[PDB]
Amino acid sequence: QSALTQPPSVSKSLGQSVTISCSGTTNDIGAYNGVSWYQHHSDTAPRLLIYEVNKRPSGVSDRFSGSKSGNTASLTISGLQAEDEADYYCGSYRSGSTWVFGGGTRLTVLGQPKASPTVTLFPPSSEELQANKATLVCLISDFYPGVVKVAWKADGSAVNAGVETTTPSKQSNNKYAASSYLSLTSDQWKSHKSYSCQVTHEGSTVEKTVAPA
Amino acid sequence: VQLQESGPGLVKPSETLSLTCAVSGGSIGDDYYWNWIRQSPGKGLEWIGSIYGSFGGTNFNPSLKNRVTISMDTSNNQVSLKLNSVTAADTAVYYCARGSHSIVVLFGYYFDYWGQGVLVTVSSASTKGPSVFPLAPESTAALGCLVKDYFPEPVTVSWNSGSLTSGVHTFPAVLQSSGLYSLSSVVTVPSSSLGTQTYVCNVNHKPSNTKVDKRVEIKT
Structure with missing residues (x-):
């Protein structure tokens, strides 16, 4: 029942140091020196950083250190790198022989260079068109910060439906990716002279166009 | 271990x-x-x-x-x-x-x-295998595979049976209001290799026990 409370999000700049707290109870963090910390990147297994409050496994740099005071534990990360953007979870054994993970803290590393999106737009394949469908695919890559707005146009005019866009997700190079799909019929696709994918990122827009002819 | x-x-x-x-x-x-x-x-x-x-x-x-x-x-x-x-x-x-x-x-x-x-x-909701479509491809060429309308996750996509890993990028799936997912994998290649190199996306949707190897043509 009782959670280990972490701030959901925390921000600190490159090179700086950050401290992430984890507030537990007298029955876990207060009862044992059994606090551990885990790094979790997108599409990766959670990674043990700290165990028994302040011990590091081999292969975890000394930039990570842990401490506890009363019922609160803390993870400090010094020399913040882009690579450090991830979710960080504390966790502790709990009297009664259960184990509880904190809610996790998403770390954003500030001071990083803006990366404008690479936008690739595909028209429907001829195979899909033979199936009387036309899906336009807008692929958006290598952007940071990971916030975009995707809009579509037909004959230079705003498309109001048929759009489904993904949430930005982290790439292994720490930048973000996203994608957007305009789902039409073949007849609809042929009904306009052109279609556009417009990706807005940090106030600026990259637009790609395809034409049925 | x-x-x-x-x-x-x-x-x-x-x-x-x-x-x-x-x-x-x-x-x-x-x-x-x-x-x-x-x-x-x-x-x-x-x-x-x-x-x-x-x-x-x-x-x-x-x-x-x-x-x-x-x-x-x-x-x-x-x-x-x-x-x-x-x-x-x-x-x-x-x-x-x-x-x-x-x-x-x-x-x-x-x-x-x-x-x-x-x-x-x-x-x-029922399992649904994906329909796979080529995304046909200026100094660098983006070609790919649309993996359309499948359920559930995950889909894996390799290229040329895994021998092509450089410049490969498989995007997280979109989830449409139909409840079906679509994803795209694209590999970015030198356009000079479009004549010398066959490109096949290997799409695996284990949930529908379906694999598709799609040859990505340069269209005409």
Whole structure:
């Protein structure tokens, strides 16, 4: 029942140091020196950083250190790198022989260079068109910060439906990716002279166009 | 040294999620906790329970103790999990993880070795294999495969049977209001190699037991 409370999000700049707290109870963090910390990147297994409050496994740099005071534990990360953007979870054994993970803290590393999106737009394949469908695919890559707005146009005019866009997700190079799909019929696709994918990122827009002819 | 989760990636509401954790390079019967932990956006990391290798002692997350079973098969070095009466709230990537420890009543335990995790989607909707379409491709060329309207996740996409890994980028799937997913994988290649190199996306949707190797043509 009782959670280990972490701030959901925390921000600190490159090179700086950050401290992430984890507030537990007298029955876990207060009862044992059994606090551990885990790094979790997108599409990766959670990674043990700290165990028994302040011990590091081999292969975890000394930039990570842990401490506890009363019922609160803390993870400090010094020399913040882009690579450090991830979710960080504390966790502790709990009297009664259960184990509880904190809610996790998403770390954003500030001071990083803006990366404008690479936008690739595909028209429907001829195979899909033979199936009387036309899906336009807008692929958006290598952007940071990971916030975009995707809009579509037909004959230079705003498309109001048929759009489904993904949430930005982290790439292994720490930048973000996203994608957007305009789902039409073949007849609809042929009904306009052109279609556009417009990706807005940090106030600026990259637009790609395809034409049925 | 290694943990490998397996089990049905799609489970219907009210049915039982069952997973197995194949452990390699260490006996399940040794002095370790073997743990099930799940991960979802909505619930972060959640410890589900653990079984202690040396005597079989189990301990469970009190929030779902009422419907969790954990056992081990010393014979084939497997640890298993059953979670029943499952709902969409149990959709998650499920991990097997080893709990190492010193003196537990002083230092608890912690998870040093994890499996890869297995996605389990709890849904009443039917499995659907994807339709795969070429995305035909100026100094560099983007070509790809649209993997359209499948359910559930995941889909894996390699290129040329894995011999092509450089410049490969497989995008997270979109989830449409139809309840169906679409994803795209594209490989960015030198345009000079479009004449010399065949490009095949290898699409694997294990949930529908479907593989598609799609040759990506340069169209006319």
